[PDB]
From a paper:
We have purified pure cationic sorghum peroxidase from the Nigerian Sorghum grain variety SK 5912. The purification profile, using cation exchange chromatography, revealed a single basic peroxidase, similar to that previously reported for a related sorghum peroxidase. SK 5912 sorghum peroxidase shows a high degree of sequence identity to other class III plant peroxidases, Figure S1. The overall structure contains 306 residues and closely resembles the structures of other class III peroxidases—namely barley peroxidase (BP1), with an RMSD of 0.652 over 306 Cα atoms, as well as peanut peroxidase (PNP) and horseradish peroxidase (HRP). The class III heme peroxidases share common structural features, including four conserved disulphide bridges which are also observed in the sorghum enzyme (C50–C131, C83–C88, C138–C333 and C218–C245).
A notable difference between the typical class III peroxidases (HRP, PNP) and the sorghum enzyme is the position of the distal histidine: His 81 in the sorghum enzyme is much further from the iron (Nδ1 to Fe distance = 8.16 Å, compared to 5.9 Å in HRP). In the sorghum structure, a water molecule (W83) is found in the region that is occupied by the distal histidine in both HRP and PNP, and this water forms a hydrogen bond (2.75 Å) to Nδ1 of His81. Since the SK 5912 sorghum peroxidase is isolated from source (i.e. directly from the sorghum grains), we suggest that this IAA binds to the enzyme and is carried through the isolation and purification process. The class III heme peroxidases typically contain two calcium binding sites. In the sorghum structure there are also two metal ions, and at the same locations as found in HRP and PNP, Fig. 5a, d; in the sorghum structure, these are assigned as Na+ (on the distal side) and Ca2+ (on the proximal side) binding sites based on the ligand coordination geometries. The presence of Ca2+ and Na+ ions at these sites is consistent with the Ca2+-dependence of the steady state and pre-steady state kinetics above. It is probably the case that the catalytic activity of the sorghum enzyme is dependent on metal ion incorporation at these positions, or even that the activity is dependent on replacement of the distal sodium site with calcium (which would account for the calcium activation).
Residue numbers in the entry: 34 to 340
Write the structure that this text describes.
């Protein structure tokens, strides 16, 4: 593992709810079997939360920008509704199984993301626990400052990541999250219209134009054209074929700082999986609340209102 943030530990709930991790995994395994895309939704939700203020469940709050109440966001800042619901359903199950409110929503996010990776065929890894839940709503400015757009090139991505102490190795490995899940036409339409972006494989560009025949097409397509739902290194095989979906994907292969790692991971899924496991655990410790800071929410969608 990477270093543990102060206040976090492996198996934090060993005494207070030893079954907690097992309960989350069982729920995710069943839920994803019914709704395959939920795994991508849960992984994304953990990333997104971490990049918006810190890994503190701020984005779960009804009232947070990009939260479950959000009606005034663009398609690519409108997160999958089933993933918000799954976190709450898991947290409800934990209330019953733990004998009360014990496990933070922030910890559920980190666990559910790991279980999503695993059920999709990805690597298992230990998740540090002990996070606590923010009582601050995320604002639009928090979202816009924290999250790079898919139009961003590597230097801009690295600048954002450096503020949260992630480097180019983490960028390339973590971007492999796009080995599962969906993207909206509007996140990549500028690469098609008016003319095709020269960095896009021309054969793929032709296929995407059926998928998104004009700007403003309200449709989603897999991030990974090779294996949409399997967690694997095919994301990187796409890049080396110039078939990354977003600018922020394909620039990983273009840019001198990141190209070697893209090649490495396209050639070795084991190398990708090892680095992903390290980097995603690093990501999930960004600006965490620990000790008595923050709350253990009784309802992941609301701040606790009675102490
Ligand atoms: C723009 O996108 C196109 C797809 O939309 C690319 O076309 C594809 O290119 C790939 C190679 O990159 C072709 O697949 C290969 O086909 C040959 C002949 O059948 C196989 O021998 C070869 O398998 C070997 O190499 C693999 C690594 O590349 C190894 O993993 C494998 O074990 C073998 O050692 C390979 O076959 C693929 O192997 C992996 C399997 O999972 C997969 O199912 C199998 O297909 C592919 O046939 C081709 N498809 C199309 C529709 O043309 C295109 O690539 C460029 O253009 C093509 C025509 C070829 O000249 C490529 O060599 C070339 O890179 C890409 N344009 C880019 C990359 O600029
Ligand atoms: C840091 C640079 C990143 C950028 C620019 C980026 C951008 C985006 C965009 C634009 C989408 C599609 C949204 C849409 O159009 O609806 C998305 C989806 C997704 N991203 Fe990222 N991403 C980044 C990093 C990450 C990381 C670090 C992970 C996880 C490790 C991740 C996992 C996902 C997943 C799984 C989806 C699909 C969600 C779904 O299907 O519900 N991304 N990404
Ligand atoms: C958990 O907190 C949520 C956020 O406060 C509650 O959701 C909401 O309830 C309000 C009605 O009291 C409503 O105005 C908001 O629109 C809504 N927000 C969202 C995103 O749904 C939620 O309460 C429940 O579920 C909603 C849909 C209603 O049926 C309520 O009567 C339910 O209590 C809270 N969940 C629980 C179990 O308390
Ligand atoms: O199809 C919808 O409207 C639900 C939705 C919102 N954002 C999403 C991201 C990925 C998959 C589905 C959705
Ligand atoms: Ca895949
Ligand atoms: Na957050």
């Amino acid at each position: 593992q990477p270093p543990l943030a102060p206040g976090l530990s492996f198996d934090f709930y060993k005494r207070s709810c030893p079954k907690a991790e097992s309960i989350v995994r069982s729920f995710v395994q069943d839920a994803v079997r019914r709704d395959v895309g939920l795994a991508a939704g849960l992984l994304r939700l953990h990333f997104h939360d971490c990049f918006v203020q810190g890994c503190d469940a701020s984005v779960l709050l009804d009232g947070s920008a990009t939260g479950p109440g959000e009606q005034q966001a663009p398609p690519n800042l409108t997160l999958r509704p089933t993933a918000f619901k799954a976190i709450n359903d898991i947290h409800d199950r934990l209330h019953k199984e733990c004998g009360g409110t014990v496990v933070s929503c922030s910890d559920v996010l980190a666990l559910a993301a790991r279980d999503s990776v695993v059920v999709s065929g990805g690597p298992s890894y230990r998740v540090p626990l002990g996070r606590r839940d923010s009582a601050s709503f995320a604002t639009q400015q928090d979202v816009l400052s924290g999250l790079p757009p898919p139009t961003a090139a590597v230097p801009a991505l690295l600048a954002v990541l450096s503020k949260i102490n992630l480097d180019a190795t983490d960028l390339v490995a973590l971007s492999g999250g796009h080995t599962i899940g969906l993207g909206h036409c509007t996140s990549f339409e500028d690469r098609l219209f008016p003319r095709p972006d020269p960095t896009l494989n021309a054969t793929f560009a032709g296929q995407l134009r059926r998928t998104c025949p004009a700007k403003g097409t309200d449709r989603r397509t897999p991030l990974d054209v090779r294996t949409p739902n399997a967690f694997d290194n095919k994301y990187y095989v796409n890049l080396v074929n110039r078939e990354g979906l977003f600018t922020s994907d394909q620039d990983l292969f273009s840019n001198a700082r990141t190209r070697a790692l893209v090649d490495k991971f396209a050639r070795s899924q084991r190398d990708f999986f090892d680095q992903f496991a390290f980097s995603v655990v690093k990501m999930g410790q960004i600006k965490v609340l620990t000790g008595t800071q923050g709350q253990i929410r009784t309802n992941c969608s609301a701040r606790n209102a009675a102490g």
